[PDB]
Design a protein around this ligand. Structure first.
Ligand SMILES: [Ca+2]
Ligand code: NI
Length: 153
């Protein structure tokens, strides 16, 4: 009612269909009056891997300190349209809190260990058109309570 006031905006920094990397950019805004503990916040980006390989996420920049933002990859079960895996982004305790009526960006890439290609065009979370942050319900966010933003596939 006031404890999940996290607005999530998103775009893709690189929009090549055949791409050796995926470039998620999130903007998270605390739209409420109470601080949000980022250590409890998770984000998901859903996609089809187009050839499963070990993957790595890098956060290149966030105001909270890029080293405090990490990613792991999970398989969808069962798989569904546009989604056989997701990236899950997490924040460490050193990321701190997100103050009332403030926002932070989280800018990351991910790639396969052998740098082989993805097809972005079929990915559930991919936005082929946005060039700026946009309110996007095809990425999800979570608190300790569970889902707080978006539509899971
Ligand atoms: Ca794909
Ligand atoms: Ni609430």
């Amino acid at each position: 009612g006031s404890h999940m006031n996290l607005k999530v905006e998103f775009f893709n920094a690189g929009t090549q269909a055949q791409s050796n990397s995926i470039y998620p950019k999130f903007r998270l805004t605390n739209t409420g009056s109470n601080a949000i503990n980022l250590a409890d916040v998770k984000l998901h980006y859903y996609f089809t891997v187009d050839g499963d390989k070990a993957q790595t996420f890098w956060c290149d920049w966030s105001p909270v300190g890029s080293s405090n933002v990490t990613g792991t990859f999970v398989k969808m079960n069962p798989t569904t349209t546009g989604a056989d895996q997701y990236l899950e982004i997490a924040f460490s305790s050193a990321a701190g809190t997100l103050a009332a009526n403030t926002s932070i960006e989280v800018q990351g890439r991910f790639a396969k260990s052998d740098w082989t290609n993805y097809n972005q065009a079929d990915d559930y979370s991919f936005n082929s058109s946005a060039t700026t942050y946009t309110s996007w319900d095809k990425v999800t966010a979570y608190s300790a309570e569970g889902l707080i933003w978006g539509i899971e596939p």
